[PDB]
């Protein structure tokens, strides 16, 4: 999660097991892929403002290894397509998008990464 304390720069903090349990319960209160599901996962992403690594770690906790890998596969294709067209605040010279999305200061890029990560569920059966 990325914290936004008043005044000081934003900072990253690891998931707490209670955070992940809370998200798991909220998500499990809706059928996977359903409109209420996608709404719940999006609201959880808003709550914790996670980095790219945070999002990967969350799915690793929520889903089976192969299903989380399927998401990663779908997201990688979305990222490639997004990189071809250009992404807000992304210069390939500063490193891979997934790595840049882990810099707490790059909010605009993190938020766009979050939207791509959310979009990649559109395939998850």
Author numbering: 1 to 125
What wording appears in the published article?
Human T-cell Leukaemia Virus type 1 (HTLV-1) is an untreatable retrovirus that causes lethal malignancies and degenerative inflammatory conditions. Here, we show that high-resolution crystal structures of the mature-length HTLV-1c CA protein define essential lattice interfaces and identify a distinct ligand-binding pocket. Across the known Orthoretrovirinae, CA is a two-domain protein with HIV being the best characterised. However, our structures reveal that HTLV-1 does still have a pocket formed between helices 3, 4, and 5, albeit an electropositive one capable of binding to either phosphate or sulfate in vitro.
